[PDB]
Structures are given as C-alpha cells and as structure tokens.
Subunit: 453 residues, 4 copies
C-alpha cells in the first residue's frame, strides 16, 4: 500500500458519488444565494499535503517545529486578505484560522464578551443568521444564545427594511455589549453608519458579518462595512468564491491603542480551535488573490446586474419582492400574491433541477409554509450567465410555479402536494419535460473546477 | 477566466509554497505523534466540488433541496465509521460533521451539560488536551474552562500512570457531570473499566476522546473504549490517517438512551453551520481504508515501531515516562541526560527531525519541559520498520549530544537557540547531520500526490 | 469598693442605667421624629404594642425551618406564633388559605424579592421591572449604563420598562412590545415612587402573552390594599411581596404571598419556602414575626381603614395645595399615599430643595422627573402622607405643611440666586448669617407645629 | 387609637404567647449551642423608635436626610465592634448592617467573587454551615452553591479534626477564590495560620466565619482569627449575647491599599440589602459594649469551664466525644457506644425540657438517625450555671438516654418510638417525672431580659 493510488481506482463507490454530485451541479440552475463554484486552483490547494501539518499557534509563535512553510503561507493569506479589502495593515489585522463562518462569530464573542454578556442581531425569521444570537419562544437554539444573552432586532414589516429607529430604542434598554450588522436573507444595503451611531451611543462593539456580500465589498461594487465597524467576520465560500473557511478582521493600532488583536487571536486558539486547517488556509489565499483582480470586479458587477435582471423579470411576471427590489446579489420573492407558498414552490423547483430555498416573509403566519423564496445570482454568474439568461431562469421558475399552482388545486396538505408530484403521471410528465429543458439550458454553460469531480 | 486553470499556472507563488511543504515532509523524520501522511485518494475527495454544496441539517432532514448525493455521501461516511470500529447501528450512532477534534468535544459538552456544569479531564501538563477543560493558575485557557467548570485529574508522578485512586477521591468531592478519558501525551493504555466504575458511582457521563489512538482501536490492536464509554470523540487525521475532521459516536437504543438528538442538535444548529462535505467524503475514503487487512498490519507495525524506538532510547541511557509504551508514542525524559525538551526540540528541528517538547513529572521548572513526545504513525506510513526506527534514535542521540555541547557554551534558552543558528562551528555540524537525516528520509515512499 | 463596683451583672438592667451613651442617642432620635414634618413616603411610626414584641425574648430562639418542620425542638410556642402571623397576614388581605399561602420569614423587603427570584428562576434568567429613575426599586433589577448595581441584575438578567415621559404613567404599550423581544421569565409590577394605580390586569395580560410570572411588589401600598381603599394586586398576581413597615405600620420585615392549591396544582409554595430557608436565610427573627403579627391584627380593624382613607385624603390635600401655589405634579395628581412634585418650572431642583427642607426639619427626598438632564440635580421631590397621618394630621394640617414647604422653596430660590454650584449652595445655607437666621426661624415654626401632634410608640424612645 | 397602648391590653393573644415562650425559656435546660439569652438593655434598643428610620447608605453618605442621629449610632456601633475585637481602626473597618449571619456571608461573596466563582467550606455533615457552600449529591441547597461554585473540605474521620493536608491537596486542584474557616459544629480550635498558608499558596481569600466563637474571641479566651484572616464575619446573637444581626470585618489601609472596604460596603447596600435595621444596630452596639468588660471575660471563661465540665462528666459515664474532647463552648457527644441514636435522644430530651440537637458523627450511615448530639454551654452559663450545675445537667441527660434505651427496646421504627413516648402510659409517667425535676432545677436560676416576656 502506497497511499499514492487514485480515488477512481481505490474507492470506486466514492468516485461515482463525486461524479454524480458534479453532474447535479452542472445540470441544475443553482439559485441558493450562499453557494458558488470554487476554482480548480483553490481546490488543488485544498486537497494537498498541507492537510498533514499540525501548526497550533501563530506564525513565529507555534507550539511545534517544522512550520517554516505554513508560516509563510498563513502570513501570505493574511496579506492577501487585507489587500482584497483595501485595508491598511497598520490599522487592520486578520485571523485566517476560523474553520467556517459560525466558528468565526463564536470566536469574536468569546474574545470580547464574558459568558452571559449581551448581543443583538437581526432575528432569524427577519433575515439574520443563527450565530447572531438566535433563540425562539420555546428554546435556545444557537449556542450564541446559550453562552451569551441575545435580544433580536427586527425589520419594519411594512417596508421590509431593518427598523433602525426601533433598534436604537431597544438597545438603550437592553444595553448590548455587541451588535451584529449583517444578514443571511436581506436584499438591501445596511446603514452601517447608523449602526455605528447606535453602538457609540450604547457603548457596544459593532461587528459586521459580511459573509453574503464579502466579494461585492472586495470588488468595491457596494459600500464597505470596514469604514464603520470595529470587527468584520466573513466566510470565504460565498461571493468570495473560495473554499469553505472563515476570517476575522479587527482594528489594530491607535484608536490609546485598540485591544482586539490579542483577544481575538487567543479566542481562536487556544480557546476554541485546535490545529489550523492549512489546506483551507492555502485555498483561501488562492481565492483572495483572484478577488483582487479586474476579472473579479467584473464578475461582481455582473452579479448585481444579474440579480436586478432577475428581480425585474419577476416583477414583470406579477411576483412581489420583499422590500420591493434588490441592491445586492439576491432577491427575496414573496409568492403569497400568486397563491403559492415557498415550501411548495421549493419542492416543485427542486424536481426540475432549480435549487432555491423557502424563506419567511413579513407577515407570514406559519413556518411550515413560509410565503417566499430566496434566490441568488452568484453561482450562475460564475457560469457566465448574463441578464438574458437570468430572464430565462425566471421563465422556467414561472413554469414551475404554474405547475405548483395546479397541484395545489388538486391537493390539501404539504405532504399530499409532495407525493402528488411523484405519483400523478400527468404531473410528473410536465415536471419531466420542464426538467429536461432546464437541464439542456444549464448543461450548456461552463463550470469552474475540475472536469468530473 | 474559467476557474478551470491549474494552480501551477494561475498562482505560481502559492504553487511553489505547496511544493516547498511537500519537500519538507519528504526529507524529514516526522515524529510528531499527532501527524500522518494522508492518501492521495482522500486528498482527491477533499479538494472536490463537494466544497460547493450548502447542506445544513442531516440526511433526509435538510433545510434545502438538491441534497440527493451529499445525503448518500454523509450516510455512507456514517456506515463506514461504524464499520471501522465494529459497531452495531442498533447500539451506536455517529455524527460525521464536526469540523475538527476541538469542535467535536465542545459539541458533546454543549449537548449534555448546562453552562457552568462540571467536567474532569487529565491535566494538560500531565498529558490531557486543551479541550478537556484546561485552565492554569493564572487564567482560563480553553473555552471548555470558560463555558464549563473544570477540575483536572492527575498522573501519579512516581509511576507516570493516571492516578485512578485520586480521581475517584476527588470526583466524589467535585461531583462532575462528565469525565473525559483520553490523552494527547500518554504512552499507556487507559483503564476504561475503572473510569466507568467512577462515572457510575458519581453519576457522570463517560466521554472517551480517543483521537490519538483511533487508528489502533479500529485495527483492534489495543482494547476499545466503546466497550465502556457513553460517548466517544476522535479526530480523523492522526492514527486514522485521514483528512482533518472530527467524529462523535454515541450510544443509542435501550440502556432508552437520549444522546442522539442532543448531540446532533448541538453540532447543528447550535454550534456549526454548513457541513464541509469535501471533508466528510475524504474521511469516508480513509475510514474504508481503515477496515482493511492492510490497515491492521499498518497499525501492528506502528506498535512495533514505537516499541523499537522506546527500546533503543533505553539502550542509549534515556529515561521514558512510565518506563515504556503500549501505543504509538514514546514519552522521553531528557532530564537525567542533562538536556530539556525545549532545547532538544529545537536542535532536532534544525536537523529535520520534528518532535515536540513534553512536560515530565520530574520537572522542576513548569516553564521548560524536561521531555519529548515522539510518535511512530507518520514514518510507519512511509514503510519504516523497527531497524529504521533504531536509526532514527541514533540520529536523535547525535542531535542531543550537539545540544549538550551548546548548553555548556550558553546561558538562557534564547541564547541556546541563537547559538545553534549563528555559531559557524555548530551550524556546520548541524548541516552534516541534517544532510544524513534527509538523504535517509528521502529514500522512503510517501503517501499523497507526487509533488504537492 | 461600693455601689456599682459591688453589684453583679444580671442582664436585667435598664438601658438608661447600663448604657447612658446609647440611651441619650435613642432619646435624641425620638425627639427628631417628634419635632419633624416627616414626609418620606416609605416611613411610618410603629405602635408601642408591636415594638414591645419586637424587643422580646423571642430574639433568643433558633427556629430554622417551618412550623412543625423544624430542625430543632422546643419550638411549640414559636410555631403557634408563626402560624398566627400567617393567618393574620391572609386575613388582612382577604385571602382564602386554600388558595393562598404566606412566608413570614423574610428579613426585609429586599430579601423577600431575592427569595422569589431564587425560587422561580435559574441564575441569569430574565426579569423586567420599572426603571429606578422612573419610579421602580433597586431590587426590580436595576443596573446603570456603567455597572451592575442591584444583586438582582448580577445574579439575574434585567431589562427595565419605562414611563411615558409625556403622561408620567407606566407605558404599558411599550412594555408589551419590549417583553416580546426580551422574553422575561418574571415581570415586577410595583413601585417606590409612583402616584397612580398600577393596571395589574394589563400586567397580567402581558405576562400571560409572553409566559412570564407576574410578581406584584406592593411594599408602598400594602396598607392601602389591606384597607380596601385601592384595588388589590391579588386579583391578578399569583405572587405578591411586601414590606411590613411602610403603610402597614409594623416592624421592619418582609412577606411573600403565593397562590397554592388547584390551578393540576400550583407549584410556588415549596419553591418559595425552600428559597427562604435553607437557600438564602438562616434562623428566622421570631421577634420581628411577632411584631408583624401585632401590626397585621391592627390592619384588620375599622380604625386602620379610617387611617388608610385619611392617608389618601391627606395626599390629595397636599397635591391640591401644591397645585394652587403653582407647583407641577408628575402625572398631574395622586391616587395613593404620595405626591411627586416637579420643581423644575419653579426654578429649583430636588437636591437643593431637599437640603433646605432638611435644615428646617422637613424630611422629603429628591426625585428624578421625566426629562431631567442630570441626576446630581434631579428635578423633583417625593412627598408622602402615611407618617404624619399616623400622628392625626388632617387635610388642613397638610395644607399647612405645604405652606412651610413653599417657604423653604423660596429660601432655596434666594440662595440659588447667590451661589453657583450645588456645593456652594450647601455651604451658603450654613455660613451666610442672613440665610442661617431665616432657616432657624422657619425651623422653630415647623418644630412647634409638629411637636403638638400625638406620636405612636413609647414616650421617650 | 394612639399606637401608645401596651401589648398586654391591645393584643392579649400575642401577649399570652410571649409569656408562654418566656416561661419555656425559664423552665428548660437550653443546650442549643447557638442560643443565648439577650440582655434587657439590648432588647430595649431593639424595640425602639429606631425601627421607624429609613437610612439607606452609610454614615455621612446617605440617600435621604434626617440621619444625624442614626449616623452617630451606626458609627458608635462600628467603634464598639472594633473595640470588642481589639482592632486598630486604621487597619480594620466593619460593616454593621447585615441582617443576620447568612446575609453577612452572602455579601462577602458578592463583594469579592463573580457569579460562579469557586468557594470551599467545611462540609455540612462534617460541621460546616449552609452558607459555606452546601449542596448535596442530589440538589443545590444553599444559595451559596447556586450563585457560586462550591466544593467541600472534610474532617479526618479517624481524628475528628479538619484534615488540613487534604484541604491543601484539593484546593490546588479546585483553585478556589475564597476558603471559609469557621464552623457550626466543631469542638476544636481552627488552625487559622494553616488555613492562611493554603490560601496564600492558591491565591484565595481567607474568610473566617467566627459566628459560634465570636464572644470567646472578644473575651480573649481562645486565639483570634483576626491574626490570620483579613475578612471576618459573625453573628451577634450567639456567644456575643446580642440581638439577631450580622457583622463583616475587613482590613483597610496599606497592604498599595486593601480594596475590601468599598466592595464589601457596596455589596451590602445597594447590591443586596435595602434600609438598615437601625433598632438592631443599636441593640448590637449595646451588646458590644457589654462584651468589652471584665464581666464578659469572666462569662466567657466560665463558658469554657462549663463545656469542659460537661464533656468530662459524659466521658466518665462512658459516652464518647467526637474529636476526643473540647476546646470551646460546645461538646459533640457520640451516642453510638450507648446504643441510642441522636434523633431518638433529641426527642426524649425535648419532652423533659432539655433542648439539644442531633448531630452527624464520623462513620454515620443514615442522616435520619445520626449518631450524636451537639450540646453547648453559653445559654445556661448566662443563667449563672457553674461546673457542678453542668454535672447535674449531664445527670439529667443520662436519665433521658436511659428512658430512650428502654423505649428503643419496645419499639421498631423511629415513628413508633416517637408515638410511644406520648402514648405509652408508663413511658409518659416516667417522662413527666423527669420533666418536673428538670424544670424545678432550671427555674431556680436567674434569667437575662424582661421579667415575663
Ligand atoms: C486527545 C485530543 N483531542 C482532541 C484534539 C483536537 O483536535 P484538533 O486539533 O483537530 O482540534 C487533539 C489534538 N492534539 C494535537 C496533538 O496532540 O499534537 C487531541 O490530542
Ligand atoms: C451572515 C452569515 N454568517 C455566518 C454564516 C455561517 O457560515 P458557515 O455555514 O460556514 O458556518 C452564514 C451562512 N449562511 C448560509 C446561508 O445563508 O445559506 C451567514 O449567512
Ligand atoms: C417597592 C419596594 N420594594 C422593596 C423595598 C425594600 O424594602 P427594604 O428596604 O426593607 O429592603 C422598597 C423600599 N424602598 C424604600 C423607599 O422607597 O424609600 C420598596 O419601595
Ligand atoms: C458558622 C455560622 N455562620 C453563620 C450562621 C448563620 O446565622 P443566621 O442563622 O443568623 O443566618 C450560623 C448559624 N448557625 C446556627 C446554629 O449553629 O445552630 C453559623 O453557625
């Protein structure tokens, strides 16, 4: 046994699964707003001998020897991270070790807050992330609501925008130590200057969690949270089009000096994590280099143009959009006007190889049947889709909604609806014909990555 | 731009860095007990399109659609993890999503304990891990000592073994809700039956963190913690020779056990986000390798190589903490030899021999460890046999003797280290030994890709 | 060797002979009480009968535990006393013992509240109370922008609710809105400085919506509730705390009332009793329990209802006389035993005013008013009727009190015109002879008026 | 109604209860070690107009005016507290507001410790107090085990003394922030120097809770904890013979200053308490002045002699004593070498007007039938009992034990034993005969306080 054999020869069962997943990615219209297609070059680094190295600590201050090269790699990743976001190294630093977005946010809280200290984030149903402190009326869900004390802030339900007035009012009462400015499902730009004004008033730290918009910020196609935030976290796998990982950026130097750097780094290691994933660090450095180029600015501009074109095509077809439209990479569709909920539409669309996700809308009454869908442009933009192609995407979505509207007319419950899509041969024929046309269209576009896996 | 360009063309700077790390691995005697050389096959899965897929939730109970294939992959990984450890699904389940070892242990605590509930693990200086609740006299270090309340248990310093008697005595006073049985630096087998007795007496959960020994357990060359533990965590990148990831195994069925829902909920949605499906797949590749006769022979050889290295050090007048080994590693006490582990680790590093300093019970300076931790898994993966490990020990001894000369000529640690670099006479002797070490090491096979 | 050198200690000596220094101090405090216009809204004058029980051999008895469930024997009499106090507590508030129980051991009001929190909540569970500047109490969860002040904000997680600044009333609408976001496990309805009746029905609505416990802390109003002169919180709360020394006119102590029996049963009783003992307290203060029982029996009488109705009438007379002299009142009036004066329009703050009044033997306390721009210089005064009502003051007597207050306010306005900082104002009251003589004349007139009225308790101590 | 009517005229029911309790105190042999008989002078202050004054805050730093006289009283009480313990006011301060012992200890923890910080105290079954952190295997019992994290230390079961070696060992592992040296049932002197050594080694605060022994310390008849602890709590109603209350003493001044004073005072008010009980403060001040006198040193010497006389008489009658003897005001009798448990014995004695309490002994296996009794000398010594009188006390105890043995031989369960004492005519006649002799003896001795209440 050498350990130099190929995957296709040594584990045919797993090789076939990898090929099947690649085929799914190539034949579908992937609209999940948080997905993208990582470059072959980044994946070549991800799947490398860097996986083998234990390097707990930080460059020059490791616990083990043999770190000469991973030191150089980690420091290069830091430099490319600051370069990608146009940050002066004397005013900003970055921790490139977080294993994903959720680890990054937990490390920030652990660095800057004591257990049971208070945080405020946008409520999950209103478009925030689990790690912004989510708990429900009946139990504590995110660990960020167990180890810390959270209170959400909300959209203004009439407008679909973050209610900055109510946030200010309730932060004066709750006295958060940290407020999170960032979203998983919000189509508008965040008023970071106002967020900072609230935080300065109540003496809270401002954390911007820019995971969804990070590449747009790097490409300078939307305003940067770094102009107003103390700390900025992100993932590397969304609009940044990298391998799955996290980053934490923090201010350093003169404010009296800043005191984030030592606390942030200590929280990541030794408090929370173990050995870094040097293969992920390397892949991230590759993608960060890509994000610095003119190619990536043009990609990011096309992401916005494509999201806008998707929004307009939906409005032209009588759909409604939460907040009335978009200013970023995604659109929040409200389907209740058309008479079909997001759980139903999501399933019909899945069966024709269009992947989206059901999304709660302002005013929704039940979670099992949310009113909306979240649709994103980053992934398909990476396949060189343009505006006209996203109009075809909406054409196909509308066909699927129409199919769903007929099945809803012949079915009672969410489970009846779902089996009907499989049982009724007349329904599964229309699904099959739509799926074939969907896959013919999607299969025709290029795809980043390896050829077959 | 296609995103299909090769790394070698599109990012030369990073490509030469990857090649440099591969060269470093190939030319070294890599004795870090937690390291291994992952197979090309697993690395091919690790760097795949599985990176692209968001799949929050669990097979058949995802937040989103499109998960047909990742569902099959995640379920296959679970099946292969149970098979590698000879586990019946009716008695055991597994969570294959933890991003690493430390995430795995934190998920167990979050799942079973309230904030500030009490845990006991082996103290870090005595061989336990950070995530077993480590804090120092000076401040709280691991988050496992911040969100939970930890009190360590200790070695008997006269034997080098876990002091099960004192663990029993202190557990009755401290009342832990969970006790961790598992080590980062311990060369003997843990008495899991005794740990079970203590846990039963004080009504604590028994967690076995088998990260270091996981490959040996799968290979059935040492006894298994699954006979006595409620929960077992592990990494997949040490003796299991996989990609970097974690696993949480838990009892289920009649005892009914109530671990499964809590464990799975803690990993997601409580602690983690989207799974790293490329990592899950790579782990599944390694787990299948771990079920083969090849891997049992590998693991038997790891044991024999550790024993051979131990016996050679004893022959050269080294002392061993607990007097020997029954697993993949050796704990060397350099104190009698007159050199500490901080000094020895650095001299060895400069001759391409990678180990790490290790505290010894006989230590008089809590700041400067008196020992080294040496492991056989990595070099065994390159087909080293017992005689090769004897030659490793002769190279170590050459380096230790250099260290002793430099100690006689320098005062503080920093002085020692700088002298190794800049004293021309010393650097020449180090260069000679380094060349012999490297040319020896380069001649062995190496798992993975050819050049990266 | 003769006299006191030839006499052994008995522990039966009178205080006046055995400790002349302390005896002189007690008499001086009695004199201070008799010669002052005592307007602190939380104060009262305890009866001789209750004080005689407070200073009794019941001090000597350790009785950890509860009646019939004690750690030590010899408890037959203290058991009867504690049970009597419980029965008299329930009688005073018209409570069926099949539906309500009472714990009579809390050492004071703050211990009573902490015991409820410890009984029903886990550490760091959430509570909501009226903010301290807005009229709430420390133990309702107070912390400031700069640090945690009450232990109820240390061991538990509090967020305040607020007055509507424009009406001076509790903003029930905002409480409902914020409770939904904060998800409290317990909400406190009760105040230290609030002149209006609390809408306990609305508070129960909010608590029912968000699945919180409703605690009514009726300390200030307890005697008014007992006398049935204002609505009872027991109609809507299932837990009620109080002190025994404010409007109930007893010895310093606390009480915790709780629902019991069929709600499927209530499960307050065992937890609240356990929190008080063994969790928080040690041996009860049986002398205090007995004194409280004496005052509770008094509170059941027609005499006490007539007292409580007079407290309301006197507070209203004080309010009306203030309004006639151009004073502003927070919420525009009073429905209870106290008045909240807003001095800002008159041009004088509550810190300045309380000090002038103090120097003429009128004891009130400065009080934050809605819109105050600075707490060193709060805008108002809190003025209470219970203590002077116990001395048989009637409405015209409270009109005379206001005349004296207004004279003091006028002296303060004159001193403010002559000084800059609060520290200079205060020194001027003492060092300027013109001012000092004006204060002495007003003090003489205040004291001669007050001394003529009867006083509960012993004659001289 | 004037509020000037006497208790006897206005509430005859309560008046009769007070007289019944007074009669019970006069006719019994009160051996509860934490009890005493407070002076009339102290009681006159306790039942005074001082009840009426709200005085939140501290002297010269109050919330409300009118505090001129209560300021003088509180400061006088502080000076008298320092004087009774021979403390230099430039090196020690004292807080006289705690409402009882348990409030005093909770205030110390709240002042010096964060929530969930670690405390160690002597385990309750081994002689410690609830407020030293007690929890059982099954439930958190004391609030000091809920808001803080406690671990007990133990007696050496062979010797009956605190095991200082094991305390040192376990404190190194548990890392307490505070260790309590003080007991509710311990007959020996505590090695405060050794406790301090341990605290200095692990960097814990040493709190001496001297409640039981405070009068013996003030009289200088046993060594003072103030030589080795820098924080000391106590009650005022045990051997100090005052009204029920608490005190917290702390070092102040140059240690770089001590920082106890401001934290302790703030913990008491505003954190934990509300208005002080000025009547109690005054009564405490009266008792403290008494404690400064030669009379009180003679009383305390006699307490020691009487406890030793009682111990000696029990040994001569074949009883065993936990730890082998006594050095203080109490004796821990082990009844197992007589064959009668403490639950049975306590009840027998109660029915013959001798009040003691059952006490767990080393080796006991059931808390429901512990092996012993705790007996104290302070209360009866305050009635002018001398050594021969305590020998008579032991004679009566032994008769009671013998009755208990006879009933034990005729009954099964604890419940049957207890009902036999009341319902067996022969046993009831024997108890009545013993009770009359006990009461005839006890009534002949004087009693501090009022004549009839
Ligand atoms: C027993 C044990 N448990 C958990 C971990 C954590 O694994 P991660 O580094 O992936 O978080 C380690 C790592 N120990 C590394 C070493 O011994 O060198 C470990 O030794
Ligand atoms: C704002 C935000 N923050 C953090 C995360 C967490 O990243 P990980 O999944 O790597 O833990 C997400 C993921 N959001 C996924 C989605 O919106 O579909 C996110 O949207
Ligand atoms: C509503 C309320 N609750 C509890 C207390 C506390 O009682 P103790 O001081 O006995 O702890 C007060 C005292 N407040 C005093 C005042 O308003 O002036 C109070 O007003
Ligand atoms: C050492 C010690 N500390 C504090 C207390 C508490 O005092 P309070 O009961 O006033 O809260 C006691 C009471 N112990 C009483 C006994 O031993 O019988 C005590 O023994």
């Amino acid at each position: 046994w050498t350990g130099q054999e190929s995957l296709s020869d040594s584990d045919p069962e797993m090789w076939e699964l990898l090929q099947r997943e690649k085929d799914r990615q190539c034949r579908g219209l992937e609209l999940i707003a948080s997905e993208n297609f990582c470059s072959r070059a980044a994946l070549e680094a991800l799947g490398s001998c860097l996986n083998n190295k234990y390097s707990e600590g930080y460059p020059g201050k490791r616990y083990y020897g043999g770190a000469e090269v991973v030191d150089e790699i980690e420091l290069l990743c830091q430099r490319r991270a600051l370069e990608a976001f146009d940050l002066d190294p004397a005013q900003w630093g970055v921790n490139v070790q977080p294993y994903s977005g959720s680890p990054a946010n937990l490390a920030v809280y652990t660095a800057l807050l004591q257990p049971h200290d208070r945080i405020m984030g946008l409520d999950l149903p209103d478009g925030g992330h689990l790690t912004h402190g989510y708990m429900s009326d009946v139990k504590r869900i995110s660990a960020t609501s167990i180890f810390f004390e959270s209170m959400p802030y909300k959209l203004n339900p009439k407008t679909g925008l973050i209610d900055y007035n109510q946030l200010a009012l309730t932060a004066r009462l709750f006295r958060p130590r940290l407020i999170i400015a960032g979203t998983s499902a919000y189509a508008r730009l965040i008023d970071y200057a106002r967020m900072r004004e609230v935080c300065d008033e109540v003496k809270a730290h401002l954390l911007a969690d820019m995971a969804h918009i990070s590449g747009l910020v790097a490409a300078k196609v939307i305003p940067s949270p770094f102009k107003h935030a103390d700390i900025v976290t992100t993932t590397t796998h969304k609009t940044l089009r990298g391998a799955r990982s996290g980053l934490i950026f923090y201010r350093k130097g003169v404010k009296i000096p800043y005191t984030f750097e030592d606390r942030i780094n200590f929280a990541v290691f030794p408090s929370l994590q173990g050995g870094p994933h040097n293969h992920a660090i390397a892949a991230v450095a590759v993608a960060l280099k890509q994000a610095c180029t003119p190619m990536f600015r043009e990609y990011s501009l096309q992401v916005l143009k494509n999201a806008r074109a998707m929004a307009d095509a939906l409005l032209e077809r009588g759909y409604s959009l939460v907040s009335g439209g978009t200013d970023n990479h995604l659109v929040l569709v409200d389907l209740r006007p058309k008479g079909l909920d997001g759980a139903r539409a999501e399933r019909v669309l899945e069966l024709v190889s269009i992947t989206a996700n059901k999304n709660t809308c302002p005013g929704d009454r039940s979670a099992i049947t949310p009113g909306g869908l979240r649709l994103g442009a980053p992934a398909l933009t990476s396949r060189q889709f343009r505006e006209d192609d996203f109009r075809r995407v909406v054409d196909f979505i509308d066909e699927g909604v129409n199919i769903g509207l007929e099945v809803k007319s012949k079915t009672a419950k969410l489970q009846d609806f779902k089996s009907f899509l499989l049982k009724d041969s007349e329904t599964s024929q229309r699904l099959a014909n739509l799926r074939q046309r969907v896959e013919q269209f999607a299969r025709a576009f290029p795809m980043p990555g390896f050829d077959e896996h």
